[PDB]
Amino acid sequence: NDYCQHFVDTGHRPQNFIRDRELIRLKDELIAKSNTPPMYLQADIEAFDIRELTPKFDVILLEPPLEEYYREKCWTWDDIMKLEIDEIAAPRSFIFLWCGSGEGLDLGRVCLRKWGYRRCEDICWIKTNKNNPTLDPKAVFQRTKEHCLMGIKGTVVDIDLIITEEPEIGNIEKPVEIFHIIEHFCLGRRRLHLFGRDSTIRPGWLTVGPTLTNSNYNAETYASYFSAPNSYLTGCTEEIE
């Protein structure tokens, strides 16, 4: 019945009581077989000319470190809005922007429009508190979720929900399941993760962030992964012999 009352009564979040074919694995294998080597570059994105990242990307995952993530250098929406993301996005391409739970739900939409995208999905990371049954001044409710907005530019399975336990204090990691959702869309193979970390580096992705300890990025080597005959693969099909 009323899990809201139950949360008021006990501190167990309603999402704690959410409960819970066989072909979405050859797809996973095809994705794995088509992925480029993991590539990564340590770069202070504020001081970095973003245009040195080439070629233009089919998918951009943007995870700026918001101050709200450190409740107990952060980026403001002022900083994020001034990124020139449109300068590195392919004319047909996609973006996934972690917006948090506060003002980013509005300002992240401003960003998407500024960079030339329209929002097509709102993906909610719902955090359970099964293992452990402070409010922003403007908050009306306890905030138990984060939003990752998906945007599309140009012309043209899973659910828009990720449910995991709330990480420990000080852990800013987002659920790796976001990568699964993104890769299952089969959007192309040039995939950029801005503000990634050593811990998020992944086959099939170029990861760029200030805290990386090592780099292997070479623009010419990276471009060579997508030269003919592989220029328009989705990342979900067999390699060309």
Binding site: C4, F7, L105, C120, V140, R143, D160, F185
Partner: protein, 199 residues
């Protein structure tokens, strides 16, 4: 005052200034994404007269995720929260052309500086069963009542099953006019002596 109250009406044409001021407004509009309202009709709704200090709950889907934010701000609100309702079946399993949709969104706007509300009692996720098409979960009324107990509330675009104590419900599929608050009864009679609501 306290028992359920409602007005069958076209919300575009009702003079809502007769209703007084409300601690909470909820709307579940027929966005242009039953009969709908155009974007301009939504923008022009006289939401600003309904409140001085309090909260607005605004259900949104598809492109109204953006259009609803526009209306919210046009009407004089800042969006300070966003409730999501995770839709389940009777066994608590979860029930836009890129992803399947497991949730509905309800924007939460604030106007003025509400005082004496119990902010932070509930969280921003509802887990509740899909009842019927376009039926919102009853849990939202409980969250709103704990947030603002005993106060006057108004629902726009509600249906007969939405009528609640402490609420006045407006919608064009309600059965007649049922008003009990003496202040509202008086202002309705003055404004609508023949009981008709037209232009």
């Amino acid at each position: 005052l306290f028992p359920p109250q409602w007005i069958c009406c076209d919300i575009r044409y009702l003079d809502v200034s007769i209703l007084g001021k409300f601690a909470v407004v909820m709307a579940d509009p027929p966005w242009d994404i039953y009969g709908t309202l155009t974007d301009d009709e939504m923008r022009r709704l006289n939401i600003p007269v309904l409140q001085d200090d309090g909260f607005l709950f605004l259900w949104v889907t598809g492109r109204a995720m953006e259009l609803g934010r526009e209306c919210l701000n046009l009407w004089g609100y800042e969006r300070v929260d966003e409730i999501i309702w995770v839709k389940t079946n009777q066994l608590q399993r979860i029930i836009g052309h890129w992803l399947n949709h497991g949730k509905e969104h309800c924007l939460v706007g604030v106007k003025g500086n509400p005082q004496g509300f119990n902010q932070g009692l509930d969280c921003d996720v509802i887990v509740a069963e899909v009842r019927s098409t376009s039926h919102k979960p009853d849990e939202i009324y409980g969250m709103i009542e704990r947030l603002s107990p005993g106060t006057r509330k108004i629902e726009l675009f509600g249906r007969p099953h939405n009528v609640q104590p402490n609420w006045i419900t407006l919608g064009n599929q309600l059965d007649g006019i049922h008003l009990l608050d003496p202040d509202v009864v008086a202002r309705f009679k003055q404004r609508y002596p023949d009981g008709i609501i037209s232009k």
